[PDB]
Ligand SMILES: CC(C)(C)c1cc(NC(=O)Nc2cccc3ccccc23)c(N2CCS(=O)(=O)CC2)s1
């Protein structure tokens with residue numbers, strides 16, 4: 512068992528193996544940057560805030576540990592290490608997750624570097640490639656936005672989740688559908704792509720309803736085919752009510768852009784989630800020809816998420832989490 516050291520940073524106390532040197536903060540769980548002296552790389556250290564405070568928190572802790580432990584893909588955040596100062600289940604009350612410190616997010620990049628069409632292909636290609644994998648394990652990200660996209664000096668990308676979100680949220684979510692499928696993440700990708708091509712936020716609404724309004728003027732009022740899947744009378748009227756803005760046409764919002772780019776965007780920003788293009792199909796799209804390769808776009812191992820439909824006590828969630836820490840095996 513490694514020897515630990517203690518440190519207080521922005522009134523928050525950190526307890527790490529001596530291996531992790533030079534803790535400097537970078538967010539508030541809270542997160543630090545450190546030097547992993549084992550490999551000479553800078554890493555990010557997440558220390559969970561109040562991990563087992565309530566049944567909900569405790570499940571959320573177990574979840575996040577399970578997710579990270581599973582993600583083994585180049586375009587998705589992976590676990591380098593998880594540790595705890597605790598010598599035993601009984602002492603156990605802090606959890607720390609370690610990952611590769613990626614340089615900067617997609618927001619930081621766009622601000623002082625002005626993307627080429629070639630940049631957009633490679634970047635969107637990587638999100639998509641990460642998603643095919645994600646989605647293959649029956650996981651839905653749900654909060655894709657440029658702050659959740661890490662990009663290194665070589666403009667190579669990882670998807671993660673730092674726990675405005677709304678500009679990229681699928682509309683079915685802003686109307687509260689409960690069902691949700693995987694192509695909510697495809698809507699988010701089209702909001703991200705849009706902005707990369709235009710340099711402006713596609714749906715900058717002052718509130719969720721103003722955004723629904725701008726969503727509907729561009730993509731169009733729901734077609735009979737779609738309204739047919741909406742069980743609720745009050746839902747069916749309200750969507751017609753928000754589609755009263757003068758109709759705006761797609762291809763005139765994206766005028767200087769590669770014609771294949773606009774085509775792909777028309778296939779992701781489809782109102783009916785059932786007719787929206789999936790990550791797997793998107794990768795084969797002719798906009799990604801310089802990059803697509805089907806022998807190098809894997810899917811994930813089976814991910815046992817039976818825990819998600821479970822209600823257990825705090826101490827059970829905690830004991831489960833503690834097993835996942837002990838059993839962790841790092842990558843070589
Ligand atoms: C698999 C997928 C979809 C990409 C998810 C990743 C994460 N976690 C993640 O990106 N972790 C980290 C972020 C930033 C720095 C870190 C630094 C070190 C370690 C982890 C770090 C998910 N969750 C669950 C929902 S939640 O409980 O609201 C928020 C977090 S879901």
Ligand SMILES: CCCCCCCCO[C@@H]1O[C@H](CO)[C@@H](O)[C@H](O)[C@H]1O
Nearest residue numbers: 682683688690691692782783784785
């Ligand atoms: C303001 C815009 C109107 C929102 C209607 C968008 C319809 C989105 O698509 C719908 O999403 C559901 C996701 O659970 C699916 O189960 C439905 O079958 C699908 O048609």
